[PDB]
Amino acid sequence: GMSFDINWSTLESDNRLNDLIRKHLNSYLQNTQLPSYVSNLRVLDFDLGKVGPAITLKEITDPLDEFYDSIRESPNDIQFLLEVEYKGDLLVTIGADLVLNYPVEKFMTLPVKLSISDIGLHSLCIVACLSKQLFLSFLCDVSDPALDDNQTVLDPKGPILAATKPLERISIVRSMKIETEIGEQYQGQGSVLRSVGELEQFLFTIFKDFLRKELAWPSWINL
Amino acid sequence: GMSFDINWSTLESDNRLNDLIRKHLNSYLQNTQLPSYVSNLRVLDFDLGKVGPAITLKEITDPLDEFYDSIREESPNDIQFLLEVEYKGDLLVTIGADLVLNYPVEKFMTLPVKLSISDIGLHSLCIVACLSKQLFLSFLCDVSDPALDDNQTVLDPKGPILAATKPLERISIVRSMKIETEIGEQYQGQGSVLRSVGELEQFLFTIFKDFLRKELAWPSWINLDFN
């Protein structure tokens, strides 16, 4: 490709944007139900990073007709079909309050720190634009099995775009790293470490679901 | 900012884009009048590079009306970006030249010679307009151009930038450039050869600048269409 360094300070600040994303994500978190062992989940900080994705424009066409059906509830309009490969420094700092003991009740609360980072990604996205609104979406994973025999992704009767069989499609996100810091007080006993463990499992699944319902086809991010 | 790698291979081409630029640069060279010391100028190879510019968003607006009559020529919502572009990438031009030497006697000798233009410095204000269905890029100004003091907005059509376009009244889009020259090592001894080479390097420098002026600098512009 070719190396670009893009700065949009005057459109919206990195601070501003990061906090917009942070507020969405918090909106997803405080609107999902929480388990036994976690009492409070919130996004402390979000940082999109200084490292972006490798974008490969593969096709350019008119927007899909499902958009026109979406607005019937022209022209000028154009959709990009892009092969996006992200291996960057997106960082989500999440705070939580873990509930410690089965015995008796509510024995102790703990402040805990989780860090979602190093998000791996190879995927097919479409970015459509139609007066006025701009449309970004993650369609597929590049190595998803229903692209075999070179069948174009933009086929509406295809399984991709139909989304008739979500179970069979490989997850958009290929890699992820969730780390967890607790006070050195509690690194000693395994009960705490176990609760931490499935806290990170739960967080993994929660994030999985977030991207599924926000970014994955059929779920749209709209500007 | 944020680091992007953009690839437009699906639409040609690294080869075909390079060869297009090469063909039109050759078109410029073969159509420019030459000094006595250089007989022939030609483009051996062109390579846009793997390194692009640092782009900073500098406001946004609806496209200038000049576009719309340059389309009466022949739509909301079209849009124009005003960009601070800073290029110091790896653009590489390999140019062949025929050197004329006539020291003793007359037209004594001509010398196949090979020049390398590289490290093109650039810091400028560009505008990228998109109207159905066409995308228009043009380099308006140099960042440190004197008609940008007063903080007079560039997009003022009555302002000098956009209206004037006078040949020498705006600092050249191109700030820096480095030209190397390869000749037969048997000729590295003679000073006359080296001096002719120097004059050639300067002349080539100039030529390339005005080429980029005539191709990129407002009111000249580049068109990419989707049809």
Q: Which of A4, A11, A59 sits opposite B57 (nearest CB)?
A: A11
The letter for the amino acid at B208 is F
Contact between chains at B77 and A10 (C-beta distance less than 8 A): no
A53, A85 Cβ separation under 8 angstroms: yes
**Which chain B residues touch A55 with a CB distance below 8 Å?**
4-7
Nearest to A55 among B4, B58, B75 (CB): B4
Question: In chain A, what are the domain boundaries?
Answer: 1-223
* Separation of alpha carbons B165 and B145, rounded Å: 13
Kindly list the residues from chain B whose CB atom is less than 8 angstroms away from the CB atom of residue A130.
none
Nearest partner of A116 among A137, A142, A136, A88, judged by Cα: A88
Burial A30-40 (b: 16+ CB within 10 A, else e): eeeebeebbee
Q: In B, which residues are within 8 Å of A58 by CB distance?
A: 10
Q: How far is A103 from chain B (nearest CA, A)?
A: 50
A89 CA: distance to closest CA in chain B (Å): 10
- Chain B contact set for A4 (CB, 8 A): 3-6, 52-55
- Residues 6 or more apart whose CB falls under 8 angstroms from that of B129 comprise B63, B64, B67, B78, B79, B80, B81, B135, B136, B137, B138
Q: Is A10 on the interface with B (CB under 8 A)?
A: yes
Six-digit token string for B64? 């200038």
CA proximity to A125, closest of A155, A84, A66: A84
Burial B87-101 (b: 16+ CB within 10 A, else e): bebebbbbbebbbbb
Residue A114 to chain B, least CA–CA distance (Å) = 25
Amino acid at B100: V
What are A196-200's contacts with CB under 8 Å, separation 24+? A196/A98, A196/A112, A198/A37, A199/A37, A199/A38, A199/A96, A199/A98, A199/A112, A199/A114, A200/A114
CB B95 within 8 A of CB B115: yes
Pairing of strands B79-87, B51-61: antiparallel
Burial class from Cβ neighbours inside 10 Å (0-12, 13-18, 19+) for residue A180 reads middle
Give the resolution to one decimal, in Å: 3.6
**Whole-number Cα distances in Å, B125 to A181, B89, B208, B217:** 47, 17, 19, 10
Contact present, B217 and B139 (Cβ < 8 Å): yes
Contact A141, A169 (CB under 8 A): yes
Cα atoms found within 13 Å of the Cα of residue A14, Cβ hemisphere only? 12
For residues B40 and B113, what is the distance between their CA atoms, to the nearest angstrom?
A: 10
Neighbours of B139 (CB within 10 A): 23
Structure tokens at B106: 């007359």
Distance CA A86, CA A84 (A): 6
Q: How far apart are CA B134 and CA A9, in angstroms?
A: 27
| Cα–Cα distance for residue pair B83/B151, rounded to 1 Å | 16
Coil, helix or strand for B206? helix
A50 touches chain B (CB under 8 A): yes
Distance CA B6, CA A6 (A): 11
**Structural contact between residues B98 and B38, judged by C-beta atoms closer than 8 angstroms:** yes
Contact B4 A7 (CB under 8 A): no
Helix (H, G, I), strand (E, B) or coil at B225: coil
A87 touches chain B (CB under 8 A): no
Q: What three-state secondary structure class fits B151? A: helix
Q: Give Cα B226 to chain centroid, integer Å.
A: 24
Question: Distance between CA atoms of A89 and A52, rounded to whole angstroms?
Answer: 8
Q: DSSP per residue over B11-47, as a string?
A: SS-HHHHHHHHHHHHHHHHTTS---SSEEEEEEEEEE
Of B8, B10, B50, the CB nearest to A3: B50
Place of tokens 């062949």: B96
Chain A: closest CA distance from residue B41 (Å): 29
Q: Name the amino acid, one letter, at B2.
A: M
**A193 lies within 8 A of chain B by CB:** no
Whole-angstrom distance, CA of residue B202 vs CA of residue B207: 9
Angle between helices B14-29 and B191-216 (to 10 degrees): 110
Per DSSP, the residues of chain A read -EEEEEE-TTTS-HHHHHHHHHHHHHHHHTTS---SSEEEEEEEEEE--SEEEEEEEEEEEPPPHHHHHHHH---S-EEEEEEEEE----EEEEEEEEE--SSSS---EEEEEEEEEEEEEEEEEEEEE-SS-EEEEEEEETT-GGGGGG--TT-TTSHHHHT--GGGSPPSEEEEEEEEE--TTSSS-HHHHHHHHHHHHHHHHHHHHHHHHHTBTT--EE-
Q: Which technique was the structure solved with, according to the deposited record?
A: X-ray
Of B1, B7, B76, the CB nearest to A5: B1
CA dihedral angle for residue A184, residue A186, residue A190, residue A191, rounded to 10 degrees: -150
Q: What is the residue-wise DSSP string for A50-113?
A: SEEEEEEEEEEEPPPHHHHHHHH---S-EEEEEEEEE----EEEEEEEEE--SSSS---EEEEE
Residue A210, token pair as written in the block: 């977030």
